[PDB]
Amino acid sequence: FAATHNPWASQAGCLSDVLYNTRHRERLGYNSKFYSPCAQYFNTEEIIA
Amino acid sequence: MEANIFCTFDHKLSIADVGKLTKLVAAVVPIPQRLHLIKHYQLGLHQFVDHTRGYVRLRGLLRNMTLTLMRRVEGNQILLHVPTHGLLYTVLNTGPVTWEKGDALCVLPPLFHGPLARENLLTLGQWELVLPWIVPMPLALEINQRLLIMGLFSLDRSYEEVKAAVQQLQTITFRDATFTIPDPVIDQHLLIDMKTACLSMSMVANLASELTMTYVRKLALEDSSMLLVKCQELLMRLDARPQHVSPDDEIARLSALFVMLRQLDDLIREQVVFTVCDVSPDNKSATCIFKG
Amino acid sequence: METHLYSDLAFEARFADDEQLPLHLVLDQEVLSNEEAETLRYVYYRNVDSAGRSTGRAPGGDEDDAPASDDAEDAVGGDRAFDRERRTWQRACFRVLPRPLELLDYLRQSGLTVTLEKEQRVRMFYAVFTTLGLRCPDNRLSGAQTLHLRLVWPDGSYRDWEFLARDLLREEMEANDEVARTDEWKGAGVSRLREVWDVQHRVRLRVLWYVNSFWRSRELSYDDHEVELYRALDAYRARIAVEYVLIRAVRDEIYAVLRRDGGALPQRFACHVSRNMSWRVVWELCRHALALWMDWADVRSCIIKALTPRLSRGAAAAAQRARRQRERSAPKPQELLFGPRNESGPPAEQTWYADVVRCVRAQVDLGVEVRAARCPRTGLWIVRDRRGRLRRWLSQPEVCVLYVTPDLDFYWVLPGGFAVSSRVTLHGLAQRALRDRFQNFEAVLARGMHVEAGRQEPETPRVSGRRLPFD
Amino acid sequence: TRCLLESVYTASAARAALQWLDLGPHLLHRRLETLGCVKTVSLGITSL
Amino acid sequence: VDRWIRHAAGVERPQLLDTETISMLTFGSMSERNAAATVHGQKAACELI
Amino acid sequence: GPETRPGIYVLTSSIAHWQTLVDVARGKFARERCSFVNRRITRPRQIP
């Protein structure tokens, strides 16, 4: 019942979000061939849909 | 005169359209004339709906238009039925508005909604059976009140301020739905409505009981509550015995004030057409008593 | 009739704060055409004191008095100057009467008892009724004050008239159950009717003096000091000269760059040429055409018409967006493969305004619109008409044309497309003069128009007298 | 039509193909070699 | 700064025939060498947030 | 001037022989050929 436990991972535009959300990572020079364990958590669009 | 109305189509009908017609049984459709026999062109609201002439014009036309229920429809014979006052009828709702038991229903032009489709149902090449919204009293009077407030505020204001004002005002939520007024336009119809509203407000300012102006302030000296905090906050932007008191004067003044209020009130109130006492658990139909 | 009475009541109500007294005006076929009266939207007035200061700008001087420096980013002050000039303009209540009438008979036919000295009937084909206010900061009113008048039509067009107090009040200040104010207003009537003229002596308009006007009783004082009127005259001279000093700046820039380039003029508009044409005659025709343009340039020259949209509030945001879109490096591959489609670059076609001058017969055209596109095979300019037709006046040997771009770059052209190019220097004048003399009207909501901005314009209201009056 | 089929052909592969068409210095005909006409689709992650 | 950081972290300068290869990489590309000897299996890349 | 914009067409024609087809193509695409010569003249050390 807090707001978060990692503000650098829970915000809409925090460091971890831009780092691992593919909707933000595709803006960067990112190579899609590598699997990332935290893709499922930070890919907000896919889980929302 | 007529308890039965027969509508016939010039076009040949497909079995898909016949199925849609036999599904639309018990719905409400408007008729301009209240006559024995009409062609299918003058059925529905596609006849009148020029979006350039905004929502106020269509509302004024629709409230003069008469209503009828749907019936024994078959191949190229519709057979609409006009309900009489006081009987119990089965009516099928078509809009996304949720109907709950005990609410009174009103007729209004359809509003916008989230799924953005608008569903161009029953297009006979050009003619398209656009059907009105049947709305419970709070939301419908909210439409009317917001339109009147829109007209009263918008005059002598720039489009930039009006942009935010309409972006907040045009959107209404009722039972967690999301609607917005299609076309707010300042026609002579709304201008005359505002003329009536301004005259009524001037009269209620003039003839009102002298103590009812200061009752709020006496209570504010008496009390301190969230309701009264908001009441004072409204009047704050412009901010003991009475030397005489006579009950007859107060009685006459409040009778006049009630006349003026009832004059102002029905600029927002819509003449109820149906009162519900039944609901299907899927909200798709309800049983209602008709008011004329 | 009703506008004058209502305006008297309304100015009486607010005189405590605004301290403006009402002045009732009726106008006829001398100020505006029948079409303009039939299609009038708003009437506006603005007061300028004897110091040349508008009512609505800081008394001690403002930052608008500072000059503007030609940059499109801070376009003549941005949106804040537009908001200030919006604040200074005040709106009056007006009525339109489209059927022919004479005021004496019309008022006698109404409840008002006119009591003029002589029964001279004054006829007019149509009457527009309005009442404007002029502010006295204290109980003293000055005869060197000047009042501006504006009529606004639904197309956003407007016309400016200004007249000073001493013409408006030449003789007026020297002439010094329960009753409803309407009853005594009608029973007291009016007796004095005078003609007022604009300072330039271009518009005639009538003023009515109702004896029961509330401004009578305040025993206000009036005077017109000579030095005060001299100040008003020199301030008016300063106001009127904006377009002419801009044109002179264009002249001096043209001559300066013609001196700088040694007279060698390179081609900037695509046109075929011949080595064996006599160009000396072309040069002398250019001289004569330039002199004629210097003579006949008007307030509606292309440079002012192009300056006008630069002052609208949209210009500053548009300039920021355009500069940021130009201020870009090469796009990264990531944005090309993924995300939104690329921002649309500036179009291959532009809208221009130009002045065309003829030497064969004395004739110039000033408010000419032209569309400009670059010829791909040569990189030079091609001038197209508003319908898309090609402009042939480039070929015509007797014609020289001055073009102005939206970004205030101007081309001077003699036959053959050989051109003289320079930038407009609006540095010469204060921001106040440019922002006051020219500015697009911004619409305020009224009857018959959509509340949602950007929607299609409905039928123009067009209160008319050729139809039966509508109710 | 350009806007229409540019909107319909929105994908990483199509944008990459349009990039490759213009990244090089050569003409279209040298980069392009023609194949015949098509008849079948078996839609998948990689379609046949 | 880039050269010192890459030396400290032990990674090569991004040697790529940039124009075509980068578009291929962002389209998808396999780019990391296999280690010679593996007795424990697939490399569980602990992705850090 | 700065960069080549190519045009692509699909032509239906009863002309099978190469020479007549090239003749009519050169006649209809005269502007493109003229621009080719223009670029070849204006810009040395580049080879269209």
Side-chain angles (χ1 to χ4, degrees):
Chain A
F1 298 124
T4 186
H5 292 267
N6 188 356
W8 310 332
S10 70
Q11 298 302 322
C14 56
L15 164 69
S16 311
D17 199 302
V18 51
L19 194 65
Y20 296 121
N21 185 0
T22 56
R23 287 283 163 269
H24 271 298
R25 219 193 307 169
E26 285 180 354
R27 319 300 181 87
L28 300 179
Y30 152 71
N31 180 3
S32 63
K33 199 57 178 162
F34 285 69
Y35 188 77
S36 52
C38 48
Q40 60 194 325
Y41 308 117
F42 290 102
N43 285 345
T44 286
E45 183 76 332
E46 95 190 33
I47 174 178
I48 291 292
Chain B
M1 207 70 157
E2 288 293 89
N4 310 336
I5 296 182
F6 300 92
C7 185
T8 60
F9 283 42
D10 295 6
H11 279 259
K12 103 172 196 74
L13 287 157
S14 74
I15 48 164
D17 305 326
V18 174
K20 277 177 295 193
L21 271 43
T22 197
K23 197 167 181 284
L24 261 75
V25 174
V28 288
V29 281
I31 283 182
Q33 201 48 87
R34 180 67 183 267
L35 195 54
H36 314 62
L37 164 57
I38 58 183
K39 219 193 76 153
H40 73 119
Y41 273 5
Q42 66 269 37
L43 180 69
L45 284 160
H46 163 271
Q47 171 178 5
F48 299 89
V49 59
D50 283 345
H51 304 285
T52 314
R53 297 177 65 70
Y55 184 93
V56 181
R57 178 271 202 148
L58 193 61
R59 172 163 61 83
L61 306 187
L62 180 56
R63 59 198 180 161
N64 277 73
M65 209 169 306
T66 192
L67 311 178
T68 174
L69 294 170
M70 191 179 292
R71 284 286 178 282
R72 204 192 292 274
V73 301
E74 67 149 57
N76 204 4
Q77 185 217 97
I78 306 310
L79 209 160
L80 305 173
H81 167 69
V82 279
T84 188
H85 193 143
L87 303 189
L88 199 71
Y89 300 93
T90 304
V91 53
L92 173 135
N93 77 94
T94 60
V97 191
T98 310
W99 294 1
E100 296 205 2
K101 190 175 185 181
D103 282 320
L105 298 180
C106 314
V107 61
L108 276 176
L111 301 156
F112 295 169
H113 187 38
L116 73 85
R118 297 197 194 82
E119 294 200 343
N120 315 319
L121 190 84
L122 284 152
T123 298
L124 275 297
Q126 301 283 260
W127 180 88
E128 174 190 349
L129 189 57
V130 184
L131 192 151
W133 277 15
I134 293 284
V135 189
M137 192 75 253
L139 180 57
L141 75 81
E142 182 70 16
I143 325 298
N144 293 327
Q145 175 203 290
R146 285 181 174 233
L147 252 60
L148 191 54
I149 291 168
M150 178 74 95
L152 205 55
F153 152 79
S154 298
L155 293 175
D156 206 30
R157 301 282 158 69
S158 181
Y159 272 121
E160 293 178 300
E161 312 142 16
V162 167
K163 187 177 176 183
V166 304
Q167 279 293 351
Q168 71 179 15
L169 195 141
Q170 277 187 252
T171 305
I172 329 182
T173 62
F174 168 63
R175 305 204 219 242
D176 303 303
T178 57
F179 309 144
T180 171
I181 289 69
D183 291 270
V185 69
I186 310 151
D187 192 18
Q188 189 77 328
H189 216 48
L190 212 174
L191 203 291
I192 295 167
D193 279 8
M194 288 185 283
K195 176 183 177 180
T196 297
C198 187
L199 174 60
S200 299
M201 290 180 287
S202 189
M203 295 314 302
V204 309
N206 178 264
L207 61 83
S209 289
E210 184 269 353
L211 45 61
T212 205
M213 329 310 292
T214 184
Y215 175 84
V216 175
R217 299 193 182 285
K218 293 302 100 175
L219 180 51
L221 268 295
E222 160 74 357
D223 198 6
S224 290
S225 64
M226 175 70 80
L227 175 62
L228 281 168
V229 165
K230 210 58 51 174
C231 301
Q232 192 77 7
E233 186 169 86
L234 282 161
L235 303 178
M236 161 275 300
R237 292 279 202 253
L238 281 98
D239 195 323
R241 79 171 79 220
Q243 305 85 8
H244 75 301
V245 54
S246 295
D248 307 286
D249 200 49
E250 304 302 349
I251 280 179
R253 284 182 175 277
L254 261 173
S255 198
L257 179 65
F258 281 173
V259 170
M260 304 302 132
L261 259 62
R262 285 178 284 151
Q263 169 81 1
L264 173 58
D265 175 40
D266 51 45
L267 285 178
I268 301 316
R269 304 285 296 245
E270 191 50 73
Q271 169 171 325
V272 305
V273 290
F274 278 113
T275 295
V276 312
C277 53
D278 205 5
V279 67
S280 296
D282 61 9
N283 326 298
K284 295 298 95 188
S285 64
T287 296
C288 299
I289 178 154
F290 184 64
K291 313 301 181 169
Chain C
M1 166 200 163
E2 213 71 15
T3 57
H4 290 191
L5 174 60
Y6 174 85
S7 52
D8 170 71
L9 272 301
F11 277 88
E12 187 170 35
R14 184 168 281 282
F15 172 82
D17 270 10
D18 70 3
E19 298 142 327
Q20 280 189 10
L21 73 96
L23 191 149
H24 313 86
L25 289 174
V26 290
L27 311 96
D28 52 6
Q29 57 280 336
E30 170 83 38
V31 68
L32 84 182
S33 70
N34 183 257
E35 187 65 13
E36 282 167 355
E38 181 146 295
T39 63
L40 207 161
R41 285 310 296 239
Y42 326 87
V43 59
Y44 272 85
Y45 66 95
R46 179 175 66 182
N47 274 272
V48 170
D49 65 10
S50 45
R53 294 287 299 182
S54 306
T55 54
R57 298 206 202 98
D62 214 346
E63 66 174 25
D64 277 305
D65 299 289
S69 298
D70 314 286
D71 290 345
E73 282 273 58
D74 53 318
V76 200
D79 319 57
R80 72 181 74 168
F82 206 167
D83 278 13
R84 286 186 204 110
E85 297 310 293
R86 179 61 144 283
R87 170 177 160 219
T88 193
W89 280 105
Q90 295 199 305
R91 192 178 160 204
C93 304
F94 83 104
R95 257 280 287 275
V96 186
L97 303 183
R99 288 206 183 152
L101 76 171
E102 68 271 71
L103 263 47
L104 265 288
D105 196 337
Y106 161 70
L107 296 167
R108 288 277 202 200
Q109 174 247 345
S110 192
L112 283 78
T113 167
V114 74
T115 305
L116 284 158
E117 297 218 333
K118 290 202 301 186
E119 64 150 55
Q120 178 165 355
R121 289 164 55 216
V122 281
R123 300 175 74 197
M124 47 184 69
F125 314 145
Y126 45 99
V128 50
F129 276 61
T130 186
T131 298
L132 315 183
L134 72 180
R135 204 184 110 82
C136 42
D138 63 349
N139 188 250
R140 192 185 71 113
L141 191 69
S142 162
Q145 294 173 224
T146 187
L147 176 67
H148 297 195
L149 172 75
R150 284 217 316 187
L151 293 51
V152 182
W153 300 285
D155 318 278
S157 62
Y158 61 91
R159 216 154 297 126
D160 309 46
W161 327 107
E162 61 259 73
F163 34 69
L164 84 175
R166 71 172 289 150
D167 290 342
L168 290 156
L169 293 164
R170 193 174 185 96
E171 64 200 296
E172 203 70 16
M173 286 290 169
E174 196 59 32
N176 291 347
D177 66 355
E178 294 203 343
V179 199
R181 286 208 66 238
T182 301
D183 279 351
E184 50 169 301
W185 170 278
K186 290 159 59 187
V190 54
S191 58
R192 34 200 72 216
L193 175 158
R194 292 310 321 290
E195 290 186 3
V196 186
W197 290 85
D198 178 288
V199 175
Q200 297 309 122
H201 202 297
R202 56 181 47 162
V203 152
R204 171 181 56 74
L205 77 170
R206 305 196 192 291
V207 59
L208 299 187
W209 295 110
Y210 302 107
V211 63
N212 227 29
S213 304
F214 84 92
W215 77 261
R216 294 287 210 215
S217 301
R218 303 302 190 219
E219 59 181 49
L220 67 173
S221 53
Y222 168 91
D223 39 41
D224 52 43
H225 282 43
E226 323 291 23
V227 300
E228 200 186 342
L229 182 50
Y230 191 93
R231 288 187 73 210
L233 285 164
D234 80 11
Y236 182 83
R237 164 184 165 71
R239 193 177 183 272
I240 193 169
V242 177
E243 58 263 25
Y244 304 95
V245 51
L246 200 60
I247 292 155
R248 285 185 298 259
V250 172
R251 171 200 75 198
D252 295 348
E253 268 295 338
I254 281 167
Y255 281 127
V257 49
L258 190 138
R259 194 187 302 257
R260 283 165 69 267
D261 300 4
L265 310 192
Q267 194 164 40
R268 294 296 174 254
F269 295 77
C271 173
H272 294 76
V273 308
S274 193
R275 177 174 145 249
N276 292 290
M277 180 170 64
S278 291
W279 290 93
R280 275 67 158 200
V281 55
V282 188
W283 266 108
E284 290 288 84
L285 283 180
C286 190
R287 190 158 68 96
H288 300 311
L290 192 70
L292 184 52
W293 182 70
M294 303 307 160
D295 200 353
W296 264 347
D298 190 21
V299 78
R300 67 201 205 254
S301 171
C302 63
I303 76 181
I304 306 105
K305 214 179 193 299
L307 182 77
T308 310
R310 188 134 299 290
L311 272 55
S312 280
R313 70 168 75 255
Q320 295 265 353
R321 185 214 64 246
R323 210 287 313 288
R324 292 165 201 191
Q325 191 193 354
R326 189 266 169 287
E327 194 185 348
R328 304 289 286 177
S329 54
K332 292 179 182 173
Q334 305 106 293
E335 86 192 62
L336 264 45
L337 299 202
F338 299 100
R341 283 165 278 101
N342 190 31
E343 188 86 292
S344 297
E349 193 164 51
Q350 296 194 338
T351 307
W352 284 12
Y353 296 106
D355 298 6
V356 47
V357 300
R358 306 196 73 201
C359 275
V360 67
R361 280 196 186 277
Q363 193 95 266
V364 312
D365 301 86
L366 297 176
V368 193
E369 186 169 284
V370 78
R371 279 154 175 64
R374 212 76 66 82
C375 195
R377 294 185 69 252
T378 49
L380 293 170
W381 283 113
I382 291 293
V383 278
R384 311 294 293 212
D385 214 8
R386 71 185 295 95
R387 193 157 280 100
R389 306 162 174 180
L390 174 58
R391 278 295 184 176
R392 189 157 165 69
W393 65 41
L394 187 58
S395 171
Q396 296 180 11
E398 75 279 353
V399 176
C400 294
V401 189
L402 169 69
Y403 303 93
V404 66
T405 68
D407 58 343
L408 274 293
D409 200 295
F410 77 84
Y411 288 89
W412 171 265
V413 162
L414 52 142
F418 300 93
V420 165
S421 57
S422 180
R423 274 278 302 273
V424 177
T425 58
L426 64 78
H427 157 278
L429 292 179
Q431 191 170 272
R432 101 177 268 152
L434 267 66
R435 191 64 78 160
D436 189 296
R437 186 60 186 293
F438 331 101
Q439 183 158 232
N440 272 10
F441 178 72
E442 191 172 56
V444 292
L445 271 163
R447 171 178 43 71
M449 53 162 59
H450 286 282
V451 195
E452 291 181 325
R455 296 291 301 285
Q456 173 167 345
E457 39 161 26
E459 62 268 34
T460 50
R462 199 170 194 96
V463 55
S464 187
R466 74 174 196 77
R467 291 191 291 194
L468 181 72
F470 270 27
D471 188 302
Chain D
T1 53
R2 190 196 316 286
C3 302
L4 155 71
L5 94 174
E6 186 187 297
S7 78
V8 77
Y9 282 102
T10 175
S12 175
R15 302 302 297 281
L18 294 181
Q19 296 314 313
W20 286 334
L21 285 173
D22 64 57
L23 250 57
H26 292 303
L27 302 167
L28 258 172
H29 87 262
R30 198 165 292 143
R31 276 182 260 208
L32 284 182
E33 184 59 279
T34 305
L35 319 173
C37 184
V38 161
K39 54 142 191 173
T40 48
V41 186
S42 186
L43 289 158
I45 179 174
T46 316
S47 293
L48 181 145
Chain E
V1 181
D2 191 68
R3 294 195 287 115
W4 193 91
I5 290 299
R6 286 181 197 288
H7 165 35
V11 69
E12 66 180 316
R13 188 73 172 224
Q15 178 54 220
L16 292 156
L17 292 318
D18 47 1
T19 41
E20 56 214 50
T21 309
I22 287 273
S23 44
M24 163 198 93
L25 304 180
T26 50
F27 161 94
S29 177
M30 176 172 75
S31 63
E32 187 200 348
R33 171 166 80 84
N34 290 320
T38 49
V39 57
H40 309 329
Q42 194 144 54
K43 190 182 87 173
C46 291
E47 197 140 347
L48 310 188
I49 82 166
Chain F
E3 176 194 322
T4 49
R5 291 306 306 281
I8 306 178
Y9 322 88
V10 165
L11 156 72
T12 185
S13 179
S14 203
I15 305 306
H17 183 58
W18 179 249
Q19 304 304 139
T20 304
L21 179 59
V22 172
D23 260 13
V24 61
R26 281 190 260 90
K28 303 301 286 183
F29 299 128
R31 177 184 153 279
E32 287 73 15
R33 295 170 61 241
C34 186
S35 301
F36 165 86
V37 189
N38 162 304
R39 178 173 169 153
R40 187 61 186 74
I41 291 169
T42 52
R43 189 168 286 134
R45 79 170 177 229
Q46 277 206 12
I47 314 301

